[PDB]
Design a protein around this motif. Structure first.
Motif, PDB file in Angstrom:
ATOM      1  N   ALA A   6      13.516  10.181  10.966  1.00  0.00           N
ATOM      2  CA  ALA A   6      12.600  11.016  11.737  1.00  0.00           C
ATOM      3  C   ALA A   6      11.494  10.172  12.385  1.00  0.00           C
ATOM      4  CB  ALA A   6      12.010  12.111  10.869  1.00  0.00           C
ATOM      5  N   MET A   7      10.979   9.179  11.655  1.00  0.00           N
ATOM      6  CA  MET A   7       9.935   8.299  12.207  1.00  0.00           C
ATOM      7  C   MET A   7      10.447   7.511  13.402  1.00  0.00           C
ATOM      8  SD  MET A   7       7.755   6.696   9.001  1.00  0.00           S
ATOM      9  CE  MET A   7       6.863   5.534  10.042  1.00  0.00           C
ATOM     10  N   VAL A  10       6.178   1.298   5.275  1.00  0.00           N
ATOM     11  CA  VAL A  10       6.244   2.689   4.836  1.00  0.00           C
ATOM     12  C   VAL A  10       7.124   2.827   3.571  1.00  0.00           C
ATOM     13  CG1 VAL A  10       8.134   3.324   6.425  1.00  0.00           C
ATOM     14  CG2 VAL A  10       6.500   5.069   5.699  1.00  0.00           C
ATOM     15  N   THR A  66      13.100  10.503   6.289  1.00  0.00           N
ATOM     16  CA  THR A  66      11.742  10.211   6.779  1.00  0.00           C
ATOM     17  C   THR A  66      11.780   8.994   7.694  1.00  0.00           C
ATOM     18  OG1 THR A  66      10.618  11.108   4.804  1.00  0.00           O
ATOM     19  CG2 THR A  66       9.378   9.520   6.136  1.00  0.00           C
ATOM     20  N   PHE A  96       2.824  -3.460   7.334  1.00  0.00           N
ATOM     21  CA  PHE A  96       2.709  -2.001   7.253  1.00  0.00           C
ATOM     22  C   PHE A  96       3.522  -1.443   6.065  1.00  0.00           C
ATOM     23  CE2 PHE A  96       3.940   2.179   9.571  1.00  0.00           C
ATOM     24  CZ  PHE A  96       2.964   2.880   8.844  1.00  0.00           C
ATOM     25  N   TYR A 155      10.214   9.469  16.426  1.00  0.00           N
ATOM     26  CA  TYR A 155       8.843   9.921  16.713  1.00  0.00           C
ATOM     27  C   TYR A 155       8.104   8.795  17.442  1.00  0.00           C
ATOM     28  CZ  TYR A 155       4.183  11.898  15.900  1.00  0.00           C
ATOM     29  OH  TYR A 155       2.917  12.412  16.062  1.00  0.00           O
ATOM     30  N   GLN A 165       5.157   8.292  18.876  1.00  0.00           N
ATOM     31  CA  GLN A 165       3.807   7.933  18.424  1.00  0.00           C
ATOM     32  C   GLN A 165       3.783   6.996  17.205  1.00  0.00           C
ATOM     33  OE1 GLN A 165       5.020  10.909  19.307  1.00  0.00           O
ATOM     34  NE2 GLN A 165       3.399  12.440  19.648  1.00  0.00           N
ATOM     35  N   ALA A 166       4.913   6.817  16.530  1.00  0.00           N
ATOM     36  CA  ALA A 166       4.900   5.944  15.361  1.00  0.00           C
ATOM     37  C   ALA A 166       5.021   4.477  15.758  1.00  0.00           C
ATOM     38  CB  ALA A 166       5.985   6.335  14.351  1.00  0.00           C
ATOM     39  N   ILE A 176       5.591  13.833   8.186  1.00  0.00           N
ATOM     40  CA  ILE A 176       6.969  14.022   8.656  1.00  0.00           C
ATOM     41  C   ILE A 176       7.721  15.107   7.883  1.00  0.00           C
ATOM     42  CG2 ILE A 176       9.293  12.953   8.646  1.00  0.00           C
ATOM     43  CD1 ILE A 176       7.582  12.055  11.070  1.00  0.00           C
ATOM     44  N   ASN A 207       0.833  -1.202   0.000  1.00  0.00           N
ATOM     45  CA  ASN A 207       0.000   0.000   0.000  1.00  0.00           C
ATOM     46  C   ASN A 207       0.872   1.257   0.000  1.00  0.00           C
ATOM     47  OD1 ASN A 207      -2.941  -0.978   0.366  1.00  0.00           O
ATOM     48  ND2 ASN A 207      -1.872  -2.064   2.024  1.00  0.00           N
ATOM     49  N   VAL A 208       0.937   1.948  -1.140  1.00  0.00           N
ATOM     50  CA  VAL A 208       1.796   3.132  -1.267  1.00  0.00           C
ATOM     51  C   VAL A 208       1.321   4.250  -0.354  1.00  0.00           C
ATOM     52  CG1 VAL A 208       2.689   2.754  -3.586  1.00  0.00           C
ATOM     53  CG2 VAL A 208       0.461   3.847  -3.298  1.00  0.00           C
ATOM     54  N   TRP A 248       2.705   9.066   5.742  1.00  0.00           N
ATOM     55  CA  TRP A 248       3.728   9.308   6.754  1.00  0.00           C
ATOM     56  C   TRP A 248       4.717  10.363   6.309  1.00  0.00           C
ATOM     57  CZ3 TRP A 248       4.274   9.020  11.646  1.00  0.00           C
ATOM     58  CH2 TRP A 248       3.491   8.112  12.370  1.00  0.00           C
ATOM     59  N   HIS A 293       0.393   4.287   2.686  1.00  0.00           N
ATOM     60  CA  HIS A 293       0.970   4.303   4.026  1.00  0.00           C
ATOM     61  C   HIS A 293       2.148   5.250   4.055  1.00  0.00           C
ATOM     62  CE1 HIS A 293      -0.773   0.170   5.371  1.00  0.00           C
ATOM     63  NE2 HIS A 293      -1.536   1.174   5.772  1.00  0.00           N
ATOM     64  N   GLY A 294       3.102   5.017   3.154  1.00  0.00           N
ATOM     65  CA  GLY A 294       4.316   5.809   3.103  1.00  0.00           C
ATOM     66  C   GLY A 294       4.054   7.227   2.652  1.00  0.00           C
ATOM     67  N   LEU A 295       3.083   7.399   1.758  1.00  0.00           N
ATOM     68  CA  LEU A 295       2.748   8.732   1.282  1.00  0.00           C
ATOM     69  C   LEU A 295       2.215   9.568   2.430  1.00  0.00           C
ATOM     70  CD1 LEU A 295       0.952   8.114  -2.130  1.00  0.00           C
ATOM     71  CD2 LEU A 295       3.318   8.717  -1.739  1.00  0.00           C
ATOM     72  N   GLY A 306       5.608   3.219  -0.314  1.00  0.00           N
ATOM     73  CA  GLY A 306       5.215   4.553  -0.724  1.00  0.00           C
ATOM     74  C   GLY A 306       6.387   5.497  -0.908  1.00  0.00           C
ATOM     75  N   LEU A 307       7.367   5.415  -0.013  1.00  0.00           N
ATOM     76  CA  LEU A 307       8.520   6.310  -0.045  1.00  0.00           C
ATOM     77  C   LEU A 307       9.296   6.122  -1.340  1.00  0.00           C
ATOM     78  CD1 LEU A 307       8.278   7.614   2.716  1.00  0.00           C
ATOM     79  CD2 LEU A 307       9.966   6.062   3.605  1.00  0.00           C
ATOM     80  N   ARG A 338       4.167  18.581   9.643  1.00  0.00           N
ATOM     81  CA  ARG A 338       4.794  18.706  10.949  1.00  0.00           C
ATOM     82  C   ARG A 338       5.639  19.971  11.045  1.00  0.00           C
ATOM     83  NH1 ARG A 338       9.831  15.022  12.972  1.00  0.00           N
ATOM     84  NH2 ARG A 338       8.827  14.102  14.818  1.00  0.00           N
TER      85      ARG A 338
END
Ligand code: C2E
Ligand code: CA
Ligand code: CA
Lengths: 177, 178
Positions: free
Chosen positions: B110-111, B4, B107, B2, B114, B116-117, A14, A3-4, A10, A6-8, B7-8, A18
């Motif tokens: 930083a996560m 991340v 990113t 999950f 953080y 809360q992550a 960040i 799932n892209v 976050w 999720h990262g998009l 997407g990154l 923020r």
């Protein structure tokens, strides 16, 4: 699996929200103090983020709706203040922008090597909104100076009315509690 | 489940690499003309992307290795900032290339900080490797990738200059070999 969104979500938080959200309310606070006598009333203190589920982000807000007009620039300490119109009358003002990561989802749907369909795109767009809402719920640079405006358009639509509804609901909340 | 990093990597490709890469070799060739006339130098042709698995990104390359020495900005022809660095061995110029860290690792770091992550150093490292793999897969089928960029992934226990020089030298070999 995969799932892209999720990262998009976050990375949008960040690497962007923020950083600008605290002090955003300070440039709006400052602006209101300085210019309330010219401004018939005040600008909502929250950043309004448009999340069209079709992932369609135009270069100018008024292209999506002529009832959304650029009003003035929020001075730094880019953010624009827009006026929302009803029958040519100003019904509200606020700082408005599209959630930029939705352009990635749109670009991916047009990139064939991604194997990412319009169906996938819509699903990831909804997932983006859900993940982002969750993130903002527990953030210190709170939701409280930010509001998500997620909408699915049909197949006529007033974006300005959609925004006006949130603005009016926000003011109701402010004065009831 | 999950992840991340998916997407990154897609985001880094779509919103940055596919935009910068098509013009990259023309900006380098143009600079290479003057670099070659003026100093008898030659900048390599590929964008070098540092992917430290520890997600440590300095705001200045030299801070990670004083043998990596900033030389110039790569001129334009949007407004994209790329830095050309000289790589040094014993104070001597061993090579020259467009070099930068993959920003999305910031990113991941930083996560990591953080709370809360609920994102630990163990998650961070796992996601850094997935980021590398995912980006690799994307670039395998990417048209804007000639290849005109090279991924330099590395786990630390160190010479970054020597890690990069090794890639520059492998690249030149391939160029003159095939
Ligand atoms: N409205 C608005 N939104 C913003 C702004 N800055 C960041 N964002 C939003 O936040 C997303 C993630 O930013 P990121 O953490 O910097 O993550 C970036 C970053 O790591 C990298 N990147 C983008 N531009 C550059 C660049 O010029 N140089 C380098 N080295 N990396 C870049 O690619 C990632 C993806 O970028 P995007 O697709 O653009 O996606 C951006 C964008 O949607 C902003 O000033 N205004
Ligand atoms: Ca009250
Ligand atoms: Ca390091």
């Amino acid at each position: 699996n995969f799932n892209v969104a999720h990262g998009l979500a976050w990375s949008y938080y960040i690497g962007y929200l923020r950083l600008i959200l605290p002090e955003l309310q300070a440039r709006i606070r400052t602006y209101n103090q300085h210019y309330n006598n010219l401004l018939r009333g005040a600008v909502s203190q929250r950043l309004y983020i448009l999340l069209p589920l079709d992932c369609g982000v135009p270069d100018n807000l008024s292209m999506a709706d002529p009832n959304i007009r650029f009003l003035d620039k929020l001075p730094q300490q880019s953010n624009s203040i827009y006026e929302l119109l009803e029958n040519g009358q100003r019904a509200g003002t606020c700082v408005l922008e599209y959630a930029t990561p939705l352009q990635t989802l749109f670009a991916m749907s047009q990139y064939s090597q991604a194997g990412f369909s319009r169906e996938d795109r819509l699903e990831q767009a909804k997932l983006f909104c859900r993940t982002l809402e969750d993130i903002l719920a527990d953030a210190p640079e709170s939701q409280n100076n930010c509001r998500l405006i997620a909408y699915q358009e049909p197949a006529s639509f007033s974006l300005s009315q959609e925004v006006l509804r949130h603005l009016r609901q926000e003011e109701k909340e402010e004065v009831t509690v």
